[PDB]
Structure 1
Amino acid sequence: FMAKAAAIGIDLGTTYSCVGVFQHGKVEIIANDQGNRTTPSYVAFTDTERLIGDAAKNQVALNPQNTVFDAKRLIGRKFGDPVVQSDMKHWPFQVINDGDKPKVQVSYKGETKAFYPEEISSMVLTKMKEIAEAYLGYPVTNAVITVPAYFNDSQRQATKDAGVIAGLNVLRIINEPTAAAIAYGLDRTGKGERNVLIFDLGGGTFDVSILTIDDGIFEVKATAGDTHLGGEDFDNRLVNHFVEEFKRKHKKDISQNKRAVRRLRTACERAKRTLSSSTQASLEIDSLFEGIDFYTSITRARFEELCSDLFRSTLEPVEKALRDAKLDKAQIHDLVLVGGSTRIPKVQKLLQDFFNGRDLNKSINPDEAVAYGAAVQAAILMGLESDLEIDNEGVIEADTDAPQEMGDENAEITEAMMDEANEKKGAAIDALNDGELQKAIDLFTDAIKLNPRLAILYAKRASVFVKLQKPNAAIRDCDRAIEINPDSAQPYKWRGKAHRLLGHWEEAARDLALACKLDYDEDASAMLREVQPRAQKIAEHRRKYERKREE
């Protein structure tokens, strides 16, 4: 057999999200369908479907009121929190009050519906998960997720909840700066006391953290920064600068066409990125306003000057952080750049100048470091079952065939489509009865293609996939059914069996027990009894480890 299924590491960001996995001695930051190693934390709702990530951020100009972003800022907070109310006047989507809990309110297929920030976030998570499963070729259940160090118990729990919704087992919620240091192996290289500063300049926020690490244990000493200072503000500057130039050169105002503004803003996003590895950046848009083309350029120097106040303002939070730790600049051993905006040579130069030309740790991609760290720690927690004598009888080799055909959630189901699929169900249960397993699978596929929203379809196909020694395939079908209806008992029964087939001991015991509560089977009952001693020996050993690292 090959390796067990890996655990993923996820950076759930305010502006972008990022996922990694540790395999064959190294972390892989995973690229999504559109090719990018990071994904906008965006969810959009429309007339026909739900959009997530790049597709959601790209159509914003067209659908500004049902395109949700910045769910991280709401997460774990009260509608009555001054921060939320302060925030609500900058977003173009509606936020409503639900018993002192905030919910984003949108239009979605001609009906109004609302979502807790944990729900929005769980939609992002799901996407990240899906990105990883496409890379790996198999279903993922276990994750590590990161949060800012300033996150209270409320926001932490809320971030775990979002994971649980997206079908993840959350192994650990860990601090973003802590994730960064783990990435730079600042825990395992050292045999003495070292003090560490994480300069995190992201898309929406700026975070300075000083951490102390002795004996391989992280302790947060100070936190600071600005929860409203990010790369998105620099885009404002460029945008503001160019609108004004457009007035000057072309004698027209463009502020009021939203679509022309975005087109400018996205052009500016790209331009700012090029200005990190080039001194100059060209900027061409076909037909910006009333048929007028905009061809222009900008220099690094000029960009720097437009953001003048902003860039300089990242040294004050540094000053304040040392001040809270009771440390002098000289006393920090390690400087670490994370966040995508730290790609900006000026922002780099300013920091190095504060530390008198000392070397910055930046070999690890600054926008990938958090996820990187998260993946390493995910690998360690899973890795912990190495130390235990676990009997591996009954475990089989992971099936690797390509993902079977699923439904289409949003495709139109006709009245006749309900029946034709309904018949197929009965025809496939006959092939299982008779003993021709592939035929049973094949007609369930015709059933599912025709009715993609009947949850028993997926569960029953999953049953057949198990008889066929294809547990991953079953896990997939059960994952879908449980999405459609988390209350039906069948899918838990079969996912339990599938997990057990794969040595996923803790996963098997959760499902088989849940299946037994909802709908008692003698079989599942014994499966669970057979499964428990493995799950609790693993769980006890992981808990012990974490207690040792809680000190």
Structure 2
Amino acid sequence: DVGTVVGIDLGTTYSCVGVFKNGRVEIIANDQGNRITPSYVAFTPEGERLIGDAAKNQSNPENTVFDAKRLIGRTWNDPSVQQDIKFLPFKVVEKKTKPYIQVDIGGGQTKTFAPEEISAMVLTKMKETAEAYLGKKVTHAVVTVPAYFNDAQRQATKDAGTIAGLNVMRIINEPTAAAIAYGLDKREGEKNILVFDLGGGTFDVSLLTIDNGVFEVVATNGDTHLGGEDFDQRVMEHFIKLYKKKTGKDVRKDNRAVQKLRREVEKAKRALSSQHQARIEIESFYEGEDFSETLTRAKFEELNMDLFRSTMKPVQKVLEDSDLKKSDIDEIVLVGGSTRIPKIQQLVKEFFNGKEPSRGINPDEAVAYGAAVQAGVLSG
């Protein structure tokens, strides 16, 4: 008895949970009213452990933990790990051959956590979110991973499940889950599917073939350090220079001011996917002074155009590695929150000479959606 099996997208930056109920997939909102949840943990000075939006919205930069998915299932001496820790503000140390996260959990008490223990906290939050919606406990889940994840990374994701009290019944590839959300597994004959996935921290392109309901990952590419976070940073750098020019003041001296500008930049960015201008407003921004500025859609695109254009090179490379040309692609699936950007949508369509991609499922929810589709059949 597996009860009601949940489908979970465990994201580098944002996670999402769905279930199959009364004949369809439902994407579940968390206790803050959001259908996606930051993959973030924080420990307050009083010793409270925060998870999700409360963790990300909080200033404790050494004792905030995020990007665990970059570390999960890897050894300490993995060259990728050694590069990434240069950029993470929290302490990472070697322990039992692995990169354990070290933080102060309250009142000067130091604790170390395996990356899978951090991911377990996130999964626990996703579990609670499902249980609140369902009105009952859940014991089992379908969880997704990037198609390039290896044996140790897959097993470590299962182990995160176990720690969180979830039996991870199936590990499914993220681009496959997206395809399933769009019903593409129920096609006759052979098709080639290009999945274009641009999230918060990472960019993944995958070529899948489908043949009577069975998926094969033929080639993968992308950039592990390109995503919407990089678009926010370009906008931050823009307004920081503008503020310096207007006042003579460098706002990078006050971290919490930057933290505020970041929160508002991300919010505005998202508004510009459906409006042409957005206003950024921050009370007592720096040295008691107010910040009020507008950002247009055209300027957001100017600031990021090189980064947007850079996404096409890995698409070209997966086609080469798969020995296919553009006209061989039968379906284009846009995945990830950043694919909500009009210019990203335009660029992909142009690359494929006017071919419309699949549409109808929010792109930051599609991976969890497909996971939920499989979980529904497993619930019976």
TM over 0.5: yes
Assess if the C-alpha contact under 8 Å between 1:207 and 1:226 holds in 2.
Answer: yes
Larger RCO (CA under 8 A, 6+ residues apart):
2
2:294 matches 1:307: no
Three-state SS of the structure 1 residue aligned to 2:171 is strand
Assess if the C-alpha contact under 8 Å between 2:2 and 2:379 holds in 1.
Answer: no
Q: Deviations over 1:108-156 (max 9, x none)?
A: 1221000000000000000000000000000000100000000000100
2:56 matches 1:57: yes
Give 1 or 2: higher helix fraction: 1
1:185-224 alignment to 2 at 5 Å? 185-188=183-186, 190-224=187-221
2:229 matches 1:232: yes
1:69-468 alignment to 2 at 5 Å? 69-109=66-106, 110-188=108-186, 190-383=187-380
Letter in 2 for 1:93: F
Three-state SS of the structure 1 residue aligned to 2:268 is helix
Three-state SS of the structure 2 residue aligned to 1:173 is strand
Assess if the C-alpha contact under 8 Å between 1:74 and 1:84 holds in 2.
Answer: yes
Assess if the C-alpha contact under 8 Å between 2:13 and 2:39 holds in 1.
Answer: yes
Q: Shift in Å at residue 20 of structure 1?
A: 0.2
Separation in structure 1 between the aligned mates of residue 279 and residue 247 of structure 2, nearest angstrom: 18
Three-state SS of the structure 2 residue aligned to 1:277 is coil
Q: What stretches of structure 1 of length at least 5 have no aligned partner? A: 384-551
Q: Shift in Å at residue 344 of structure 1?
A: 0.3
Separation in structure 2 between the aligned mates of residue 5 and residue 349 of structure 1, nearest angstrom: 43
Separation in structure 2 between the aligned mates of residue 37 and residue 319 of structure 1, nearest angstrom: 33
Assess if the C-alpha contact under 8 Å between 1:171 and 1:378 holds in 2.
Answer: no
Separation in structure 1 between the aligned mates of residue 292 and residue 253 of structure 2, nearest angstrom: 20
Q: Deviations over 1:316-354 (max 9, x none)?
A: 010001111111100010000110000000011000000
Separation in structure 1 between the aligned mates of residue 230 and residue 283 of structure 2, nearest angstrom: 25
Give 1 or 2: higher strand fraction: 2
Q: Shift in Å at residue 67 of structure 1?
A: 0.5
Q: Shift in Å at residue 4 of structure 1?
A: 8.6
Separation in structure 1 between the aligned mates of residue 247 and residue 17 of structure 2, nearest angstrom: 44
Letter in 2 for 1:295: S
Assess if the C-alpha contact under 8 Å between 1:200 and 1:338 holds in 2.
Answer: yes
Separation in structure 2 between the aligned mates of residue 124 and residue 83 of structure 1, nearest angstrom: 23
Given the two structures, how large is their TM-score scaled by the length of structure 1?
0.68
Assess if the C-alpha contact under 8 Å between 2:271 and 2:278 holds in 1.
Answer: yes
Assess if the C-alpha contact under 8 Å between 2:2 and 2:139 holds in 1.
Answer: no
Q: Deviations over 1:364-397 (max 9, x none)?
A: 10000000000011111232xxxxxxxxxxxxxx
Q: Deviations over 1:512-534 (max 9, x none)?
A: xxxxxxxxxxxxxxxxxxxxxxx
Separation in structure 2 between the aligned mates of residue 308 and residue 4 of structure 1, nearest angstrom: 48
Separation in structure 1 between the aligned mates of residue 284 and residue 353 of structure 2, nearest angstrom: 48
Q: Radius of gyration: which is bigger?
A: 1
Separation in structure 2 between the aligned mates of residue 145 and residue 242 of structure 1, nearest angstrom: 39
Assess if the C-alpha contact under 8 Å between 1:209 and 1:224 holds in 2.
Answer: yes
Separation in structure 2 between the aligned mates of residue 28 and residue 163 of structure 1, nearest angstrom: 21
Q: Shift in Å at residue 99 of structure 1?
A: 3.2
1:11 is aligned to 9
Assess if the C-alpha contact under 8 Å between 1:42 and 1:53 holds in 2.
Answer: yes
Separation in structure 1 between the aligned mates of residue 190 and residue 97 of structure 2, nearest angstrom: 45
Separation in structure 2 between the aligned mates of residue 368 and residue 324 of structure 1, nearest angstrom: 29
Three-state SS of the structure 1 residue aligned to 2:243 is helix
Identity across matched positions, percent: 68
Q: 1:29 aligns with which of 20, 27, 30?
A: 27
Three-state SS of the structure 2 residue aligned to 1:213 is strand
Aligned length: 378
Three-state SS of the structure 2 residue aligned to 1:76 is coil
Assess if the C-alpha contact under 8 Å between 2:3 and 2:379 holds in 1.
Answer: no
Letter in 1 for 2:55: A
Given the two structures, how large is their TM-score scaled by the length of structure 2?
0.98
Q: What stretches of structure 2 of length at least 5 have no aligned partner? A: none
Three-state SS of the structure 1 residue aligned to 2:117 is helix
2:37 matches 1:39: yes
Separation in structure 2 between the aligned mates of residue 85 and residue 300 of structure 1, nearest angstrom: 37
Q: CA RMSD for the aligned pairs? A: 1.1
Three-state SS of the structure 1 residue aligned to 2:185 is coil
Separation in structure 1 between the aligned mates of residue 121 and residue 76 of structure 2, nearest angstrom: 21
1:450 is aligned to none
Q: Shift in Å at residue 23 of structure 1?
A: 1.2
Separation in structure 1 between the aligned mates of residue 215 and residue 109 of structure 2, nearest angstrom: 48
Letter in 2 for 1:18: C
Separation in structure 2 between the aligned mates of residue 100 and residue 70 of structure 1, nearest angstrom: 19
Assess if the C-alpha contact under 8 Å between 2:2 and 2:140 holds in 1.
Answer: no
Q: Shift in Å at residue 5 of structure 1?
A: 3.6
Separation in structure 2 between the aligned mates of residue 363 and residue 81 of structure 1, nearest angstrom: 40
